[PDB]
Amino acid sequence: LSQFKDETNPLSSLRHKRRISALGPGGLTRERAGFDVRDVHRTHYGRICPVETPEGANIGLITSLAAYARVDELGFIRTPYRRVVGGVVTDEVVYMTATEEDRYTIAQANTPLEGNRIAAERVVARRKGEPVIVSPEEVEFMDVSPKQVFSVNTNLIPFLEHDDANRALMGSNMQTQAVPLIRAQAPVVMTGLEERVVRDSLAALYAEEDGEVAKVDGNRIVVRYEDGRLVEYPLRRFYRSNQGTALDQRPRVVVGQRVRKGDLLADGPASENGFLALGQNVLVAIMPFDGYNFEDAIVISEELLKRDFYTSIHIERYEIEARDTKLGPERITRDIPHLSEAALRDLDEEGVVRIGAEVKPGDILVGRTSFKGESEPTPEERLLRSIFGEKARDVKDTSLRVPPGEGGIVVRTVRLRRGDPGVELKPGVREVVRVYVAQKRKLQVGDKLANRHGNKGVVAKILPVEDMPHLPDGTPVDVILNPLGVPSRMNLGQILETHLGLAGYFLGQRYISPIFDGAKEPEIKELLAQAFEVYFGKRKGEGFGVDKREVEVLRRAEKLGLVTPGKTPEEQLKELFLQGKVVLYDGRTGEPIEGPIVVGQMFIMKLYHMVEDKMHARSTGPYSLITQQPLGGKAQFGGQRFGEMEVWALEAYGAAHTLQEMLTLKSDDIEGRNAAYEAIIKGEDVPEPSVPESFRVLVKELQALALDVQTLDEKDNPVDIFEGLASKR
């Protein structure tokens, strides 16, 4: 039940703190199903999010709780429901048990309200798990909020209302995978809890009581309260999150400033201005590009990298120990026995690497020296050492090196030697050496970004701002999302965001659209109308009118049916804008893109790259002791698994040898893989497979039991698998 805090970004850890599991005591609900339990029960209202469940294996056995949900006296999520005596609604609330909820006729919050007065005769209510159109006089109790219905993690989604509950799940789990960017911006459109999230989570640092600011360091803000006291507020400069994301508190208050009680002194890892901010709001066109955005691919403007927009700082913690072998202690020294000083530079400190040094894959992070054999020296190695320099330190190079994949610049190091202060060194462990390395991750083609709705996708091409879709005024789009990904999945919410986003871009303003009560299609067409004047109003005064292009796309647009035929281009474009789409020129050709295309400010986050992401490529490497199949670990990647499902694939094909190889030379043919390599090395057409050790392991396993398995010849006669080791003596 207790696990690593998942702090990819605060929101994440917060959720992981409140999540509920089955798999526990064993007494309550194990792995067998209990199918009915996994489904979202009727009572899960305001008590559990209906979205909050991991599509897949453990499917209904886990979930974080809801908004107003609270554990009363004994663990019974009581959900709040306000009272309504007669046709009068109250501001009083009753946290009710699941059971009692059924005895009453409860109504939803969407019911037109005048205050205490219900407004429509036939208004919806739901008795006990059954939708029922009740009358104002029967309405006993009413729902508290649209928010209490789901979880925090979910509540953060813009127009949840217009997105398929299935994909809205993805959206909620996506945020749990958000990585803190050095540049954190809040959404152009928010729901209303971003504030409360950063606040209730402990990202940003708030002011206890009113006063003024004394000093504003990059490491501390010692404020002076009006009470005649002043306290120093340290700020976790750069700390290592469990999942390796930067947690820094950037001061937002200047020197000598009267602070209100509870005002942001510094911003948390991902906050802009006390607002939750992950990923960044980017202008986006929503059309198809060549194939760069084909099933779920994203085309990104190079310009996004020019500015340090999607960029994130990562830290991995390489550690090595000085073990005590009976052959002789493993010394940690700048001494690396066999070949160069070039590799010893950054190993400045005798033994450890110098802070601030750029480490690439294959550089020594820390040196160490263990002994050569198990118990005896080497006869052949005896001659060689003698030939050029007998007196050769027989010690082995076992030094922590930069593992393939990446490193950055060393920022901190820790060494614990013999006389331990108040630390716990394991047995045999002579001493430990930690090396914190940090690195800037600028967005790249391998990466995956995804908005809060669920549109998930990978970058497939970084286009030069030179030729990507550009609006009439020279401002170009940052990302081009494929439309096709929208009909199938059903989350128009994103298309609703983009639109409000367009208004907020020219109107230079951010908004807050609540869960289901938020913005409405007419209110947005309204803001778009205001935006048209900032967009095109300046255009009017700046001195110019309409393009041949702008007129041309209008022609095809009326033939389409987006603009009322007969009205002036100026007026036609307004109409066209209000619809959420504007004219766009190619960028590569300068011609327009026949037909208006929507564009706008959509928030998009960048997702954390798992260890698997470090694409694993393995040539040759270690092998398990009892099973002779490839195995990795520390620095050798470890082989991919060839499953039955995959076998058949080959089997279906006429891939005879290719399947043989997969079963012999590549994984178990002990004598095979060896001659295999060597053959390749000499450019020899690889040798014909010897018997696999899985086979020999078997036969013997089989012999271990009375059974005798002997292979036979053309005529029933022996043949030999175990090459020459089974005949006796």
Added chain:
Amino acid sequence: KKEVRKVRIALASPEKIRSWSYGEVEKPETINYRTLKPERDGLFDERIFGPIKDYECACGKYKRQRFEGKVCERCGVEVTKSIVRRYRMGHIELATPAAHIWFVK
């Protein structure tokens, strides 16, 4: 040399038990700490199952490939790598028989 074209499971004659085997494991002596070597005749003995080293013997009278198929005069070890150590079979001589549960149950 000849392609393996037929596999065959067949029951084990006690004489065939012994045929495959080398030596008799006669004592519960795994390995004795002081020397991580095989204790007495026990489960890991080098005569019974083989040399724990590449082409070399246990004592070292003969140490390279030239005589790859011969055994040492004072101690017994014919060599190819430690693989012979993982493929060879030893047998235990039961006092008064017992039976296979695979056939009885």
Added chain:
Amino acid sequence: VAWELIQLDVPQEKNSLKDLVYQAFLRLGMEKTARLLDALKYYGFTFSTTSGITIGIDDAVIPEEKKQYLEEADRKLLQIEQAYEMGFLTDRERYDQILQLWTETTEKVTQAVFKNFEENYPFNPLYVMAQSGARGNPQQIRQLCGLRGLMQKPSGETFEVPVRSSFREGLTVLEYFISSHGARKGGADTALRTADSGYLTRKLVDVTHEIVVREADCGTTNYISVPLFQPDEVTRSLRLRKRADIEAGLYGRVLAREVEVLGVRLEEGRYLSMDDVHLLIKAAEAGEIQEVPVRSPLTCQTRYGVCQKCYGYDLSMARPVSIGEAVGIVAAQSIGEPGTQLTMRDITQGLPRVIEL
């Protein structure tokens, strides 16, 4: 030859294209096809970018008839209620009568939205995608422009009240909690399906692996007769089977005995191309054949194995099957994959049945 196999009399759906591909594959040659493939891929991609098709909100168009169909069916619900308030309809009758009201009303708005687009906005973004073999499901569109109407309770009994809203407008608070109820149920079934799919395909391979094309035309001519007509849709009326199943039955098969049908003499042993399986149907339409004599795995003589003439055409390639193909698995697979789709659209359907069979 490019004109003969193309239909420029219509908008290119994925089917027209699919077809084009096929045709080009038998007509012109394998590699020459590949060329066309990338050719299409290229211009498709390009023309797509310039077309400026984009999802917007106002593009999902709600019909003006939705309010009608709703209210009409609304008052009709009132009737059903007055009819129960009096004692006429049993507790049950009411229920089954209501659902019938919606199930019809919902289907009504659906053909309504399409008719809207069909008549007024032929080029609605959200619509061409679905029409073109591109992206879009009639039932999906309905959730955006028309409305998603009925969600079931936890157990399976559908709810009495529908989901009056579309995705275009605020799917309210509860219609959303109900959507959840079934959603969990669905995700569940999907993982079972996935399991049991592997289940099935596993089993299939175990019994089928040994099956391999190794032959000379097996001389045992015991053959199966493929039916072109089916007995009982309505009690008894003989009718032409559908165009696809029949294809499934006779495509690239080997005639056991000669058949003279519309004028052409299909010889014995001949592999019937899709073009031929298109003739026999045109003939059964006319009324000259009710069955077809054809070689098949069910009647093969090769103990362990199947022969060229009895398997047929289909290698991944369209000519005869090439000796030494691992049919056993090729088969076991084609059946194990679709299985994952086996949804259940006291009797059984879906994968559960394919297990019982």
Added chain:
Amino acid sequence: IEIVVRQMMKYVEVTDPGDSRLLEGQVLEKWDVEALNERLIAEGKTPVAWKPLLMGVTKSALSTKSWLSAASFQNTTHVLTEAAIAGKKDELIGLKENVILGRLIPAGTGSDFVRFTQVVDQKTLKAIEEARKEAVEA
């Protein structure tokens, strides 16, 4: 679907014995083997009267010729026991059994039809006939 189903009926029951006692369920074609040679090559018509048997895909495979295949899924423990006692010679045909061996697949290029095929250059064609010409002694 046919290829599969067929294998659910590769087996039938026995009611009029010859070589092995009556109540036994065995591979249909393997009886067509017995009856074929028992009435055609070796005389004495000992008709082997069988009964078409329908067994499920699971069982069809659960019980088959090669024990190798059988050891893989049902009960490795029983599959062997029997296969041992009887001294079973697993003729490798089929890909599951032949895969464990790490042997070339029976199906595919592993086709006995083409495992053997050589290539020539007209230059090496005349070269080999010259070797034949040389066979002429004195």
Added chain:
Amino acid sequence: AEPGIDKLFGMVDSKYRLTVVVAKRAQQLLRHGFKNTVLEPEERPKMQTLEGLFDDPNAETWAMKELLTGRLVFGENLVPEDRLQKEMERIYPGE
């Protein structure tokens, strides 16, 4: 796709046979020396860092480019198994 794969498919009785030919031809192309070809003169195999494919890039890309021509001969039993490797060593140098 690949050059005249259809034309190739057609020159064999079995699909899986063509694969064995090309492969065994590619084998010998390298073993006995890579100049063991039947079509080098005017229009032959070619790569572009220079036109150097003429020496040793892909073995079977050759085999196929030869088989596509009518000079090679693939039989079930065309020339006796061991006498083949002997006559080939005798006539083709490059080692």
Added chain:
Amino acid sequence: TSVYIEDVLHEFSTIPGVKEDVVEIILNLKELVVRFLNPSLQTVTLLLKAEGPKEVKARDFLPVADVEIMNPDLHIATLEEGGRLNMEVRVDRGVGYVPAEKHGI
């Protein structure tokens, strides 16, 4: 194109008396726009050192003969007390975008 804070070693460090962190400042520098007048100026190293309770703006860089700073009021840092910041920021003439990784000055 390159920066050298005197007591700072890696880019991820923080300077006492300095509110901004190294990465924030190196960022603010990218915002700095300079202008030299002739080819003779390929790589110009601008120098600046400020101490104590002062705000460091781009105008605080010591003037160089043929170079001009169009971005004077840009904000580099906020120094508190005992705030010691002495750096050397390189500047070059190039084309397009070049990741700090690509050049490695």
Added chain:
Amino acid sequence: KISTSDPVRQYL
């Protein structure tokens, strides 16, 4: 069945 009891009973 289970081994301790049988011997115990056996010599006891």
Added chain:
Amino acid sequence: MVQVDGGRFATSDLNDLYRRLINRNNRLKKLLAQGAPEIIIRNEKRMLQEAVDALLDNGRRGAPVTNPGSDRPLRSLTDILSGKQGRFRQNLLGKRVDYSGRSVIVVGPQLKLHQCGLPKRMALELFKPFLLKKMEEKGIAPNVKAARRMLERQRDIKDEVWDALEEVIHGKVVLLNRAPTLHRLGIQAFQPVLVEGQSIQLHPLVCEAFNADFDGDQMAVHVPLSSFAQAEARIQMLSAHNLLSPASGEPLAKPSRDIILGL
């Protein structure tokens, strides 16, 4: 019998069962010799029997345990052959291929069905041995071991090496796999076109064969080592050759979503 950590050691559970048998077998012999009271001789012969079961198969009759720490069935030879996941069992779940790799996939629009974009950085490890030799054939390295250390660190590669790998991969092809390999087209061969970065460029048309979308699905990649494995791989396993599905005579290289929308 192995050396773990601290001097922890690790031995196959089989050895505790073997000692069982040996000690009892021995104790038996000494018990006969010493003199033999019936009850005690059987008593032991009982234990002996039971022991003989232990190694063969544990649990058919009672279940042996290592001393207080893990009430676990010491894997019996039978458990070895069968087990939860044992010998023929995971034999068939899979083994690990030596020349394999796996990264995130990304759409390769310009790529032709024929090829696929493969990270050079990946290619290097994958075709390491093929490169080493190719290095010696050129001036880049004197010998193998040289060529090896020449590449053991990232900063030491001369740009001449990429030209060697790009030359090694000339007409070879690899295989790509998807998450659930459901049908034979779940593995396809293409010609690698070495590219920068981490991602693997896949063709769009074959995205339908492999059930693969780009929100993070990762594809593995294998290497055909024999000239034969390569022969088959590129002749009968490559992509552009298998256009029509084995299930239906219907194409599978059908213009998927974007292409249609355009056309």
Added chain:
Amino acid sequence: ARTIRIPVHMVETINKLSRTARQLQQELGREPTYEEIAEAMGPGWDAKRVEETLKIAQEPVSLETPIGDEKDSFYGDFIPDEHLPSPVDAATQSLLSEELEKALSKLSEREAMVLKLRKGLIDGEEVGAFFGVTRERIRQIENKALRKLKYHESRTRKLRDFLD
């Protein structure tokens, strides 16, 4: 009782060690550092001694134990192998032996084979290394052939790249 045999003395020793740790657990509230144990035990007890004894006291672990999340994880796939030449090593021995073998032939067999065989054939004796010819001809040809060999190998650099 144990998998790795331990003499009766070591046994009582371990019991004493154990018993002692018991009396020491009695009051500290601190599982004794190996300081107490040495003291309380007696005459010749030290930290190295107790750390050793308790290292031998830990019985082995099961190479086959339920691992990670207890699903289907068997402990022995993780342990690598040492004697077996990972490909990299097989390739080494190939060039090394072919190149070492090329040099061994181009030389005088007299003192080259002596040191090749004395060092590479049996065991690691200047005097006892050469047949009849004494030390002065040994050092003579050993150091003059070993350097001509090294210096021409310096010219045609084949060995320089340390095969190790």
